[PDB]
Structure formats: C-alpha cells, structure tokens
Amino acid sequence: GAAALVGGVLLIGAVLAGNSLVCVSVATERALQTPTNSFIVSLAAADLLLALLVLPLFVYSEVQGGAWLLSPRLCDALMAMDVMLCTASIFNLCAISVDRFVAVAVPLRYNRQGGSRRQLLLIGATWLLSAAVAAPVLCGLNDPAVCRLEDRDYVVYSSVCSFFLPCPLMLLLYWATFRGLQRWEVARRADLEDNWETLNDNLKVIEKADNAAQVKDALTKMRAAALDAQKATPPKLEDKSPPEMKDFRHGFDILVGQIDDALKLANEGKVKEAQAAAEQLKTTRNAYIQKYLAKITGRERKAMRVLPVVVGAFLLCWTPFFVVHITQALCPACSVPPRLVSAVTWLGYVNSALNPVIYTVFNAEFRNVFRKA
Ligand SMILES: CNc1cc(OC)c(C(=O)N[C@@H]2CCN(Cc3ccccc3)[C@@H]2C)cc1Cl
Numbered sequence: 001g002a003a004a005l006v007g008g009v010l011l012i013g014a015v016l017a018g019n020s021l022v023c024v025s026v027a028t029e030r031a032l033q034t035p036t037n038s039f040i041v042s043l044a045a046a047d048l049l050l051a052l053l054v055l056p057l058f059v060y061s062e063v064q065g066g067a068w069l070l071s072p073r074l075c076d077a078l079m080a081m082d083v084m085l086c087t088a089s090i091f092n093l094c095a096i097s098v099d100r101f102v103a104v105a106v107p108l109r110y111n112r113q114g115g116s117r118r119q120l121l122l123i124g125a126t127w128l129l130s131a132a133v134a135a136p137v138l139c140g141l142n143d144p145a146v147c148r149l150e151d152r153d154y155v156v157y158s159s160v161c162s163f164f165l166p167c168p169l170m171l172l173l174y175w176a177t178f179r180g181l182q183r184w185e186v187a188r189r190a191d192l193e194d195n196w197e198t199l200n201d202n203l204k205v206i207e208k209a210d211n212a213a214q215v216k217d218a219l220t221k222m223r224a225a226a227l228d229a230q231k232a233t234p235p236k237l238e239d240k241s242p243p244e245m246k247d248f249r250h251g252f253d254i255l256v257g258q259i260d261d262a263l264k265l266a267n268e269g270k271v272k273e274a275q276a277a278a279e280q281l282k283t284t285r286n287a288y289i290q291k292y293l294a295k296i297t298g299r300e301r302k303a304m305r306v307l308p309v310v311v312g313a314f315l316l317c318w319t320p321f322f323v324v325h326i327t328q329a330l331c332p333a334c335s336v337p338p339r340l341v342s343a344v345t346w347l348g349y350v351n352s353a354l355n356p357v358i359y360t361v362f363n364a365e366f367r368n369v370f371r372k373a
C-alpha cells in the first residue's frame with residue numbers, strides 16, 4: 001500500500017510537471033512552434049488529463065489493494081476516460097505519421113503566409129475518434145467491488161482498434177516518410193551546407209556593415225553561393241529533365257535577381273537601400289528556398305529523430321498491457337497473475353512521464369530551450 005502511494009504520488013507529480021513544461025515551452029518559444037509540435041502538445045494534454053482525472057483514483061484503488069469502494073457509475077466514468085486518453089495518445093502518434101508523410105510526399109506552396117491549420121483539424125478528428133471508441137463504456141458494460149472492464153467483446157474491440165491495428169499502420173507510415181526524405185538528400189551535403197552558411201553569414205555581414213564596399217562584397221559572395229546551391233539537384237529530381245526542375249531552380253532565380261538589384265544599390269553607395277533589399281532576400285529564402293534546403297541537406301530528417309524514440313517508448317510501455325488484456329478477454333482460462341495485471345498497468349501509465357524526458361534528450365530545439373535553465 002505504501003509503495004503504491006509513494007510511487008503514485010511521484011508518478012502524478014512527474015507527469016504533471018514534465019508535460020506542463022512541454023506545453024508552456026511550445027507556448028513561449030517561436031522555434032518550437034511547428035506542425036509536428038502541435039501534435040506533441042496534444043499528446044502532452046492527454047497525459048495531463050490522465051494525471052488529473054485518472055491516476056489519483058487509480059492510485060487510491062491500488063492503496064486499497066485493488067478494491068473499488070465507490071459507485072459503479074463513477075467506475076464507468078473513470079474507465080471511459082481511461083480508454084479514451086490511452087486511445088487518444090495512440091491516435092495522435094498515428095496522426096503525426098500521417099501528417100509527416102503528407103508533408104514529405106505532397107510539397108505545397110501557399111500564396112498566403114501562415115499554415116493551413118490542417119494539423120489542428122486532424123488533432124480535433126483524433127480526439128473525436130478516441131471518444132467514439134470509448135463512448136460505449138459510459139453506457140455501462142459490466143454485469144462490482146472492483147473497477148474493471150468486464151465486457152470481453154468490448155476489450156477485444158478496443159485492443160484492436162486502439163492499439164493492434166494503428167501500431168502497424170503507424171510503423172509503415174513512419175518508415176515511408178523517412179525513406180521519402182532520404183530521396184531528397186543530395187550526395188554533396190557539405191558543399192550545400194557551405195552555400196547555406198555563406199548565405200546566412202553574409203546576410204549578417206550586410207546587417208552590420210560599415211560601408212557600401214562591405215555590403216557589395218557580402219552580396220557578391222551570396223550571389224555565388226545562391227548559384228552554386230541552385231545546381232545541387234536532389235536524387236528525387238536527378239532523373240528529371242529540364243516541370244519539376246522548373247519549380248526547383250525558380251526560387252534561386254528570384255533570389256539571384258534580388259541580390260543583383262541589391263548589388264546595384266551597394267555599388268552606387270546606397271547602403272540603407274541595399275540593406276533593406278537584403279532583408280527582402282530573407283523573405284524570399286523563407287518562401288521558395290529554406291524549407292527545401294532543410295530537406296535536401298538532411299536537416300528535416302535529422303529533426304524527426306525524436307519521433308521513433310517516442311513511438312518506441314510507447315510500444316515498450318503499452319504492448320505488455322494490451323497483450324495481457326486481450327489475452328484475458330479472448331481466453332478467460334488463460335489466467336494472468338493479478339500481480340502482473342497490476343504491473344503492466346503501472347508500466348502503461350509510466351509512459352505519460354517519459355515523453356518530456358525523451359524530447360529533452362533527443363530533440364535539439366527542446367534540449368536547447370531546456371539547457372537555458
Ligand atoms: C484503449 N483500450 C483500453 C485501455 C484501458 O485502460 C487504459 C483498458 C483497461 O482495462 N483499463 C483498466 C480499467 C481501469 N484502469 C485502471 C483504473 C483507473 C482508474 C481508477 C481505477 C482503476 C485499468 C487499467 C482497456 C482497454 Cl481495451
């Protein structure tokens with residue numbers, strides 16, 4: 001009993017603190033405001049809701065040796081929430097894989113600034129779907145001194161719908177996505193990184209230049225780097241002929257054109273004007289260039305490194321739970337030691353504390369936002 005209490009309090013504390021720190025960090029920091037991180041916030045919410053609505057009465061139950069002394073309707077409420085929040089977590093890991101696959105497979109360019117908010121819409125769908133899976137639990141599925149899902153048909157249904165069916169689908173999509181990105185990565189990575197650096201560095205030289213000569217020299221180096229980068233063809237388009245190739249180079253053509261206009265200004269000694277033109281180059285790079293540079297240099301694939309770790313931890317933490325529960329539901333005679341049933345439940349809930357740690361260790365932006373304690 002004391003161990004359930006101690007472990008339980010620590011668990012609830014860790015989930016609340018870790019996941020709130022994630023939510024607030026995506027809130028405070030512009031560098032964490034990305035499409036992927038919308039889902040990460042959603043997952044954090046699921047874990048916060050778990051710590052607030054489910055874990056306390058779960059811990060209380062465990063201190064009372066598994067006994068349930070409260071009403072059966074409250075039990076039904078708790079179990080529906082339990083099922084929904086577990087399902088929401090999984091469906092959101094699924095949604096990330098669907099979102100990232102579409103981002104990689106379907107390059108889009110918008111006229112208007114900003115995102116489409118399609119991630120928000122997908123996240124909303126994810127939660128409604130999870131509620132749909134969980135909804136029958138609220139209507140009362142049990143035949144009573146314990147709080148368990150006794151309906152064997154329902155348990156098989158949800159085990160399949162919430163876990164054994166989405167997990168293979170999500171693993172296939174993550175795999176296609178990573179393979180998809182690899183195809184965009186140029187062989188001569190270091191050369192393109194050099195070009196990218198020459199661009200970003202000299203933009204900074206231009207901002208703090210003392211005179212027109214320095215601005216002109218920097219612009220000249222940018223021009224050279226832009227033209228070099230324009231020749232770095234990803235393997236995806238290497239088998240293409242001079243359509244697709246028109247899209248790729250066109251961005252660099254706009255950039256060089258703007259650099260040329262800026263050079264004329266710098267050459268005439270119009271430093272202020274040349275500097276303002278260099279700032280408009282920053283926006284062009286963001287529009288037609290920067291997203292594709294990060295893809296073709298291998299940076300976007302690198303930034304996705306944290307996702308397999310999150311998925312891996314989830315599978316590690318929840319696979320025993322679902323194997324135990326579907327086995328029981330399929331085969332009453334397949335007697336699982338109550339002690340093990342309890343163990344795999346704790347392991348499932350411990351996952352809700354792990355993700356903040358995983359981000360901090362395995363994702364650069366979260367890690368850097370952390371490291372400035
Ligand atoms: C997403 N699919 C499921 C999820 C479940 O729990 C997360 C369960 C489940 O059986 N949960 C039981 C029911 C109650 N829960 C522990 C608990 C929570 C709150 C108060 C007391 C006990 C247990 C882990 C079953 C399914 Cl099919």
Ligand SMILES: CCCCCCCC/C=C/CCCCCCCC(=O)O
Nearest residue numbers: 171174175178179308311312315316
């Ligand atoms: C059951 C625990 C271990 C299973 C973890 C599952 C990992 C989910 C992600 C799968 C996609 C492949 C990820 C492998 C590293 C990236 C590959 C690459 O860079 O091309």
Ligand SMILES: CCCCCCCC/C=C/CCCCCCCC(=O)O
Nearest residue numbers: 308309311312313314316358361362
């Ligand atoms: C790729 C499959 C991952 C399987 C699930 C991983 C579970 C996550 C648990 C956290 C362990 C953290 C310790 C790792 C330290 C090494 C980090 C590093 O080398 O960069």
Ligand SMILES: CCCCCCCC/C=C/CCCCCCCC(=O)O
Nearest residue numbers: 018021022025356357360366369370
């Ligand atoms: C600001 C990041 C959002 C998450 C906040 C942190 C949540 C709890 C994590 C802290 C536990 C730290 C465990 C040690 C790993 C960090 C070490 C490192 O930075 O490399």
Ligand SMILES: CCCCCCCC/C=C\CCCCCCCC(=O)O
Nearest residue numbers: 164167168319323326327330331334
């Ligand atoms: C996606 C993660 C990996 C999944 C692991 C494999 C899942 C296996 C789960 C089901 C095994 C339970 C079946 C045992 C009783 C079956 C009754 C019978 O044989 O008639």
